[PDB]
Amino acid sequence: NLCPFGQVFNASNFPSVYAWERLRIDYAVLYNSSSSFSTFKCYGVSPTKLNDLCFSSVYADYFVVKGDDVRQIAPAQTGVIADYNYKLPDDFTGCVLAWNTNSVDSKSGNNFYYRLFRHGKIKPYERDISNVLYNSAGGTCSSISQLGCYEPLKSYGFTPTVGVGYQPYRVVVLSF
Amino acid sequence: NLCPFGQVFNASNFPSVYAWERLRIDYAVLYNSSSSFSTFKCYGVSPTKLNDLCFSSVYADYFVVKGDDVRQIAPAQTGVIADYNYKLPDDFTGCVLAWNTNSVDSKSGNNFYYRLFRHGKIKPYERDISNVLYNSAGGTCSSISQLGCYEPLKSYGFTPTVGVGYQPYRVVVLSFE
Amino acid sequence: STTEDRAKIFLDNFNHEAEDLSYQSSLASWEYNTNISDENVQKMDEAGAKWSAFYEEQSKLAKNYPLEEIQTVPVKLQLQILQQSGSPVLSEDKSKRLNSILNAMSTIYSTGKVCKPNNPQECFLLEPGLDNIMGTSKDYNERLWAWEGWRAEVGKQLRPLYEEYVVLKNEMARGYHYEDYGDYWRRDYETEESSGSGYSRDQLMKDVDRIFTEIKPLYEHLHAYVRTKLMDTYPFHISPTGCLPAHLLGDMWGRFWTNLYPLTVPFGQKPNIDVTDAMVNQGWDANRIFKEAEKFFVSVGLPNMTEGFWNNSMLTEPGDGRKVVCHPTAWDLGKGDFRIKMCTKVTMEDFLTAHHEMGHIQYDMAYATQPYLLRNGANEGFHEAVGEVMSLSVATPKHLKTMGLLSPDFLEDNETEINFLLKQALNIVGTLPFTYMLEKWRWMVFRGEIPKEEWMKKWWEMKRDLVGVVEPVPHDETYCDPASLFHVANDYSFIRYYTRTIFEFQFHEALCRIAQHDGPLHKCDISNSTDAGKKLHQMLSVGKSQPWTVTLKDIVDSRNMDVGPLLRYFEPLYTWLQEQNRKSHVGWNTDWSPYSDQSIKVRISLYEWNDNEMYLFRSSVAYAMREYFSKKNQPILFGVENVWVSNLKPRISFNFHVTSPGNVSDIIPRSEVEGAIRMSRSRINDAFRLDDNSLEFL
Amino acid sequence: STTEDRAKIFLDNFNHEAEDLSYQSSLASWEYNTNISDENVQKMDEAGAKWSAFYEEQSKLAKNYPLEEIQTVPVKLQLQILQQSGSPVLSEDKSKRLNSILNAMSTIYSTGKVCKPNNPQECFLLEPGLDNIMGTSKDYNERLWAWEGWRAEVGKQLRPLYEEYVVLKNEMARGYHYEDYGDYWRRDYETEESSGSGYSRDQLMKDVDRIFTEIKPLYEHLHAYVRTKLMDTYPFHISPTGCLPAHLLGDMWGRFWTNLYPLTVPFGQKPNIDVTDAMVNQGWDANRIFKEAEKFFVSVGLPNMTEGFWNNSMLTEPGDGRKVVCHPTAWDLGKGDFRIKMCTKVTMEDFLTAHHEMGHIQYDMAYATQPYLLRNGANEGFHEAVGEVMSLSVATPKHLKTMGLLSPDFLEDNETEINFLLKQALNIVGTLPFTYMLEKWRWMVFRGEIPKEEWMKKWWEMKRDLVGVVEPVPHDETYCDPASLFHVANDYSFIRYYTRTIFEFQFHEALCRIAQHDGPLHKCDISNSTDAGKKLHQMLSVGKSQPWTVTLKDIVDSRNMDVGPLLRYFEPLYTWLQEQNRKSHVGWNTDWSPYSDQSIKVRISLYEWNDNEMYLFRSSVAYAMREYFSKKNQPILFGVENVWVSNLKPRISFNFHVTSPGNVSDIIPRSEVEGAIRMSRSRINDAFRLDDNSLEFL
Numbered sequence A: 001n002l003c004p005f006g007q008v009f010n011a012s013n014f015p016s017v018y019a020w021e022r023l024r025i026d027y028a029v030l031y032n033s034s035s036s037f038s039t040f041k042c043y044g045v046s047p048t049k050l051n052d053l054c055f056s057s058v059y060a061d062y063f064v065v066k067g068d069d070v071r072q073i074a075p076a077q078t079g080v081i082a083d084y085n086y087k088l089p090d091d092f093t094g095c096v097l098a099w100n101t102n103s104v105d106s107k108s109g110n111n112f113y114y115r116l117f118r119h120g121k122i123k124p125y126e127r128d129i130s131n132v133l134y135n136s137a138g139g140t141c142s143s144i145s146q147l148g149c150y151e152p153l154k155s156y157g158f159t160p161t162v163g164v165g166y167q168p169y170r171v172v173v174l175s176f
Numbered sequence B: 001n002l003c004p005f006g007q008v009f010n011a012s013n014f015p016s017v018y019a020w021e022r023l024r025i026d027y028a029v030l031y032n033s034s035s036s037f038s039t040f041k042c043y044g045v046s047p048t049k050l051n052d053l054c055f056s057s058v059y060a061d062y063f064v065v066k067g068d069d070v071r072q073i074a075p076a077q078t079g080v081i082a083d084y085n086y087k088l089p090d091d092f093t094g095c096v097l098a099w100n101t102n103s104v105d106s107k108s109g110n111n112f113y114y115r116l117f118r119h120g121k122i123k124p125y126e127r128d129i130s131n132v133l134y135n136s137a138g139g140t141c142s143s144i145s146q147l148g149c150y151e152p153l154k155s156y157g158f159t160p161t162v163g164v165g166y167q168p169y170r171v172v173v174l175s176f177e
Numbered sequence C, D: 001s002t003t004e005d006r007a008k009i010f011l012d013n014f015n016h017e018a019e020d021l022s023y024q025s026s027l028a029s030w031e032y033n034t035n036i037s038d039e040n041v042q043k044m045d046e047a048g049a050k051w052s053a054f055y056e057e058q059s060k061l062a063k064n065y066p067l068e069e070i071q072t073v074p075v076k077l078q079l080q081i082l083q084q085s086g087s088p089v090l091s092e093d094k095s096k097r098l099n100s101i102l103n104a105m106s107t108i109y110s111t112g113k114v115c116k117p118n119n120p121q122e123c124f125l126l127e128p129g130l131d132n133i134m135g136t137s138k139d140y141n142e143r144l145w146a147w148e149g150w151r152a153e154v155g156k157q158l159r160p161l162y163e164e165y166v167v168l169k170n171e172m173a174r175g176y177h178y179e180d181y182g183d184y185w186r187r188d189y190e191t192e193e194s195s196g197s198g199y200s201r202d203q204l205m206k207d208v209d210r211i212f213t214e215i216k217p218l219y220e221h222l223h224a225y226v227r228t229k230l231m232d233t234y235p236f237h238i239s240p241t242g243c244l245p246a247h248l249l250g251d252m253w254g255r256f257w258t259n260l261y262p263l264t265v266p267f268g269q270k271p272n273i274d275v276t277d278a279m280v281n282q283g284w285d286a287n288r289i290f291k292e293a294e295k296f297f298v299s300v301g302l303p304n305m306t307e308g309f310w311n312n313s314m315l316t317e318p319g320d321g322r323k324v325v326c327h328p329t330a331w332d333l334g335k336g337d338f339r340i341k342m343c344t345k346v347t348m349e350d351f352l353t354a355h356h357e358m359g360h361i362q363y364d365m366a367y368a369t370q371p372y373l374l375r376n377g378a379n380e381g382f383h384e385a386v387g388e389v390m391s392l393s394v395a396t397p398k399h400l401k402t403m404g405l406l407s408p409d410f411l412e413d414n415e416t417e418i419n420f421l422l423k424q425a426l427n428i429v430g431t432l433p434f435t436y437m438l439e440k441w442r443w444m445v446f447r448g449e450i451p452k453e454e455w456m457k458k459w460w461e462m463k464r465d466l467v468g469v470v471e472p473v474p475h476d477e478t479y480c481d482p483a484s485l486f487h488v489a490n491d492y493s494f495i496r497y498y499t500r501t502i503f504e505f506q507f508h509e510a511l512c513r514i515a516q517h518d519g520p521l522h523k524c525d526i527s528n529s530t531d532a533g534k535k536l537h538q539m540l541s542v543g544k545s546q547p548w549t550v551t552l553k554d555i556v557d558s559r560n561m562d563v564g565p566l567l568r569y570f571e572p573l574y575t576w577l578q579e580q581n582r583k584s585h586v587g588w589n590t591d592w593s594p595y596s597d598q599s600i601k602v603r604i605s606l607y608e609w610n611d612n613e614m615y616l617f618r619s620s621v622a623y624a625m626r627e628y629f630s631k632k633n634q635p636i637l638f639g640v641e642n643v644w645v646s647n648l649k650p651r652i653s654f655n656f657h658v659t660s661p662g663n664v665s666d667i668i669p670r671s672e673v674e675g676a677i678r679m680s681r682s683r684i685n686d687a688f689r690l691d692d693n694s695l696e697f698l
């Protein structure tokens, strides 16, 4: 039986960087042709062929990036997505696939958000779902019209015709 | 059998009232009219019994009338065309036929004239062509910019949308002998 | 051969040739007005100019036949419009100067702008601007600003032009063997029948004075009632005895009082007769208004339309992008073609204008059999009188009730008759003294009775005496207030409106008598009366082919203008105004002014007076006003223009008052001005080399 | 923990949500400016008010972290931009009054109209009106009328509004912990690095004084050459040693002298560089022009456009019906979006303007990585200096020869270089003293050094002393001539053009030195030079993140404003003007005026003196002129406004002269005024209660 991979690559309605839901999960179509993909950079299992290789933990996931934060998806570096939203392990094995979406994620009705503020460092491969209002000092604020409390989930604000770097990018991360 | 009443009603390119010509040449066409005739006033012969009455020789004339002179074409009557262009005899037989031509004789290029001034009275049934300038005293002019001299052949000046009375009228007679 | 045996042949050559050139000139004017754009305005200068140059060309070909030898009427009258309406006998530079003066006066009138001392970027022309302000606003200061702003930023420009206009027009009319331009305007209303029994040109001036004295009891009660109702609004601004201010009359010039109807309405609970909502509810359009208007004329015996009227004349706003002018005019293009050019709406006054404009068309259709020289009215007054008397019979609430526009349960009581009669009088009676004196002022200007240094002194003296209207701001000779009217700046005769009103109700009383009317004259309808239209069509059938005195005699059985029918029309109103003006004062005195009881009488006791001490006195007063308010810590820049001089006798005395800068309605109180002269007395008399005894300052 | 561990989170919260609202505000502004219509200005306002309300809401929230306890540069600079450009500490009615004053000043400047004296109905605006007259007409009288009608019918309206504006702006700027509004405008060019070695706000005044004193000989020689060439035209109207009249400078204000180039061109047989025909002959459009500009910017080393620039920015006039504003501006909409909005044509000036606007865009594209508060120029001069210097290299007639715009047979003689340098100096050198003097006047008005009663006197004294320009008509304190300029009536800083010129020429010399140019500086092209591009982009990348002195040091190797680059650019023109002005006078005297030779000196010897004595004296002089011209049978209505008072010392003496009404250029001769005074001597001094000893009329 073929591996289930095509249920989301040819689909729509991807979540944001704070709602990335993983799937269990042929491999030829990823590297052969597929020139519409924005980048093919691949730390780990390398861009070599996947011809009948024995691998486990083939879980993969997808999320929507502003475009300048695609470079932040790499081990051992700083960045708002790595520090707050999505962190990769230092000894990361797997690969990433990304492509531009000029008029695919840029209608009038769209809502994409990122966690700008959270308490402390984040660790790779865990989920932060709660919309608890961030406090600059600590604890909670439970209000908005005061010093020290800010709303954590700020919008990307995807509008068409913003140029490269703010135009939505659908990146899919593979883990091996 | 055959009666050459054609070539004068359905024919085109009618001349002016001073340029009328004869044809020398069927009374059902007078009743079953192809075109709606404007007038049917007839004196002498009754226009109800025509088929039974015989004839010797019949003549037809055709010209263009301003419209207020259609009443003027009648035996023993006065008027500017009667005085200078076309006079009918007092002992007149037959009658006249006329019909409006609203959009047929009223294009941009249509030149029609009538004789406004002429020396003396005109006898019935003859022709006048010469464009000699009329003089109030008499004789000739040889000059348009002088006192008492006027150009005789004045234009109708037909333009569309002038109203009834100045519309071009084609008048055809059928007088016989 | 001889005269009258070659003159008609020349006259026949004109009649069958000028109608061709006039039709081309009228078609060019018709195609211009319905198609306002470029490359159409020169058609009158290319096709109508050929007809224009042809008219005086035949005038030189005229005058070879003496008028004394000919005796037959239809060719003698046709030779009378000829030999006089030719090229004006003047020098080349003077004729060029006269056309440039007339073009400058029309340009200044149509492009003038008037606006405030504050925010002087916000300004208004006249037709879409101050006409709205002077017609609708109830503010004393806003109306005064528009009234004083006009005649000063526009009328002062026309004063040097009008002085040269009078001299050039008098010289042109003297070449036509007339005594002045006023007698040349009176070349109409001039007939001759037998033994010198015709209407003289001087006979017109005697008759319009006789009519004006007869309307004086009716106008005085109308003036007194309006003045009483103009004291509820504008309190402490209108004297109960003196004249009305000129800026509170409903428009710029006080010509029509009809805009004062909301202020002076009696029985305001009773609504006026309006069928604007009734016609739009029944689905009425432009064609329905004229078709119902045409049915009125068939009912009295007048003929139908000429069938080219419907296919050619525009009766509504064009759907395509063609710019038009929406002035309702009736066009007689000649050669049996009649048209009406107006932008119609589903509105009541556009329903009455359809009857008025087609009345000119029915006038024009009747004398189409006449030659081209006599294809006009019998005079200038009959042409607009026929249109108004046809519209007078359709505004009654009986012709409207028959047509279903007015509901049958409408309350036609005696209270609503006063509302209808008064609204007529503010448009009919109220415009008669204004029309009379403005022509009377213009006649005495042309006759030389009014010198150039008393044009404005005599204009406001007759305005108080004959109209009962006082100016709010004094005007010296630098102003030209008559020229601020359209008919004066554009060189139009104004007596055609005075005699039109007399000929309205003279025809109306005669036609209602034939139509067997029984009740009051104001509730009369001549519809469904073939006998009324039969005697009507006789008067319409003849134009200039008959004297207007015998044309008038054939319809109203009188050879003279009579205002008796006019007074019988307003008899229910006249007997009601006398009841209202019982505790009030009927009349006026010519002494009170809005600037009165605040000015200071100054008597001059001689150094030499050469009109330059007026500038020195008005500057010394303005300096004293500046010094007086500076000690009160109120820095106000008083100028020469803020000092107004009235009652100027050049020998003995004059009156002066001071207004605030930037506010013409803000007259400085007399106690403050007198205190300003008192402490500045030393520098106000030594500038003229005289003591306090010479200028008494009463 | 500490405030530095809260300020960074506060600034990280600020930028990532201010960027979005700034993007919708810029999008609304773009969708208005490209789509001028209804329902387009009603979407900027609520978006702009949302962005503004958020901006002062953050500004109120910003004052929680003092700048003393933070040490790192970028957050300190961001908090320095904050907490000072916030809500102005003022009363609510005072703020409403200030907004109303600014709106009224803008409306008066934009809608002010000036009418001809002979024709009051022919009134002109400024932008499509009087600007054409001052830019094209060579008539002395028409130029004088246009210069005098403006700023008398506009500036007199703006004078009390400008006084209240000055008071309110000083009150507002004093609340921002500044001393003056001129000091508040000098909050730019204000840096700090270490031990107080930063650029002070008072250092800018000393530096621009030094720069103005260093451009004195070149501007003096240019002024002398212009004055010499302005004597062939306008004979008997310009003194060979005096200042130039203000209405003969090519513009309403004498700002740019570039319209005097056809009058003052040397070697007129040599044609100037104009490739408009050679560019319309090869089939060029907007896309080709912008692609060539992009190819030029790529060749030096700057990157391409963002590819949304081509598909979103309108380049030419749209084909459909959509009103636009045709002012060439470069739009940085934020969030990586850059656009250019202009109505370009296939013309050389539009070809240079495209390079100017794309240089502005390349300035904007470089600091996109900076935070939002630092996304500007390092001062208000670098942005326009970069925009002007990127278009200076492409105007060389060698860059055009490579592109094929110029034929290779064209000769580069030493006369075309002089013509180009003179055109540049009329554009560039001729506006530096005007800019410096106007900013000095505004600074001394805001400082209170110039009292409110000496605004106009000090303004024209510094115009004569520094610019070398004399007024043609004397102006008292009623006038406000500084307010007649757009940048003064609309509350805009004006020293940025001065700093633009200085920094532009410094950058030009630096980039030409890097690009290994060998010849003269005016024939230098930096194309195909990657070395200049790197050091250019190093300056471009940093915005407000560094002090402008440090950023300037990294490119021109100097921390100070140096005008030595400017003098080296115009060195052949300077050494040619020194040879041209050999037999002429280099400089001017501040005594000559167009009214100087016809003015009569009046000395006052005491009764009590105020401003009302001036009005009485001017009215007496007008009356004397009226009496003099009345004896010669020339009735002329002289007024107070026809008498002008100049050199008014309020204690001892003043000068006056008389002008004909309706003609401001018609000065009455001094002999006639003296004769009028002699004839009317008693009335002049008897009004003031003094003899000939007190007013002896020198």
Ligand SMILES: *[C@@H]1O[C@H](CO)[C@@H](O[C@@H]2O[C@H](CO)[C@@H](O)[C@H](O)[C@H]2NC(C)=O)[C@H](O)[C@H]1NC(C)=O
Pocket: C035, C037, C038, C039, C040
């Ligand atoms: C209104 O006027 C315009 C021109 O002023 C008319 O346009 C002309 O129409 C005639 C009709 O045959 C053409 O021959 C011309 O070439 C047209 N000229 C232009 C400039 O378009 C227009 O037809 C007029 N309107 C009507 C309804 O006749």
Ligand SMILES: *[C@@H]1O[C@H](CO)[C@@H](O[C@@H]2O[C@H](CO)[C@@H](O)[C@H](O)[C@H]2NC(C)=O)[C@H](O)[C@H]1NC(C)=O
Pocket: C299, C399, C402, C527, C528
């Ligand atoms: C003029 O007379 C005619 C004929 O009498 C009137 O037409 C009829 O009037 C009656 C009553 O008003 C209506 O009920 C009919 O419907 C009308 N039309 C017919 C019979 O065809 C006409 O109304 C009269 N007009 C005036 C103004 O009196």
Ligand SMILES: *[C@@H]1O[C@H](CO)[C@@H](O[C@@H]2O[C@H](CO)[C@@H](O)[C@H](O)[C@H]2NC(C)=O)[C@H](O)[C@H]1NC(C)=O
Pocket: C141, C663, C665, C666, C667
């Ligand atoms: C200009 O002057 C008029 C008249 O003095 C002012 O209008 C009012 O006049 C009445 C009496 O005539 C006074 O009692 C009021 O106090 C006046 N003012 C108002 C506001 O009613 C008018 O206000 C003055 N100013 C302007 C700008 O028109």
Ligand SMILES: *[C@@H]1O[C@H](CO)[C@@H](O[C@@H]2O[C@H](CO)[C@@H](O)[C@H](O)[C@H]2NC(C)=O)[C@H](O)[C@H]1NC(C)=O
Pocket: D035, D037, D038, D039, D040
């Ligand atoms: C210029 O602005 C007008 C409105 O000021 C725009 O017209 C609107 O277009 C939208 C399209 O999304 C419609 O939903 C609206 O109903 C339109 N309103 C009106 C009043 O027409 C117009 O589209 C704008 N121009 C461009 C090129 O976008």
Ligand SMILES: *[C@@H]1O[C@H](CO)[C@@H](O[C@@H]2O[C@H](CO)[C@@H](O)[C@H](O)[C@H]2NC(C)=O)[C@H](O)[C@H]1NC(C)=O
Pocket: D299, D399, D402, D403, D527, D528
């Ligand atoms: C910058 O250098 C390039 C290449 O050295 C020049 O491009 C050449 O220009 C010439 C003349 O227009 C063309 O004939 C060539 O085809 C172009 N390409 C090449 C590869 O030589 C360019 O013109 C230079 N620009 C300037 C301003 O000097």
Ligand SMILES: *[C@@H]1O[C@H](CO)[C@@H](O[C@@H]2O[C@H](CO)[C@@H](O)[C@H](O)[C@H]2NC(C)=O)[C@H](O)[C@H]1NC(C)=O
Pocket: D141, D663, D665, D666, D667
């Ligand atoms: C207004 O005054 C000016 C200046 O006096 C007149 O312009 C000319 O000025 C020169 C000397 O400056 C005289 O020699 C000329 O006679 C003046 N007139 C002309 C026509 O050149 C100007 O004419 C005056 N009038 C107007 C309407 O501007």
Ligand SMILES: *[C@@H]1O[C@H](CO)[C@@H](O)[C@H](O)[C@H]1NC(C)=O
Pocket: C298, C303, C304
């Ligand atoms: C007038 O026209 C109407 C409508 O066609 C017609 O009924 C009526 O008979 C006509 N009257 C005359 C006198 O032609």
Ligand SMILES: *[C@@H]1O[C@H](CO)[C@@H](O)[C@H](O)[C@H]1NC(C)=O
Pocket: C414, C415, C418, C576
């Ligand atoms: C109308 O008639 C009634 C009853 O006769 C009368 O009381 C009233 O005064 C009248 N009104 C007018 C305005 O004539």
Ligand SMILES: *[C@@H]1O[C@H](CO)[C@@H](O)[C@H](O)[C@H]1NC(C)=O
Pocket: D298, D303, D304
């Ligand atoms: C810039 O764009 C041009 C045209 O698309 C291309 O040839 C060139 O390689 C681009 N340069 C860079 C640095 O992207």
Ligand SMILES: *[C@@H]1O[C@H](CO)[C@@H](O)[C@H](O)[C@H]1NC(C)=O
Pocket: D414, D415, D418, D576
């Ligand atoms: C140009 O050079 C020639 C040759 O030396 C010289 O005679 C001429 O004066 C120069 N022109 C200018 C404007 O410097």
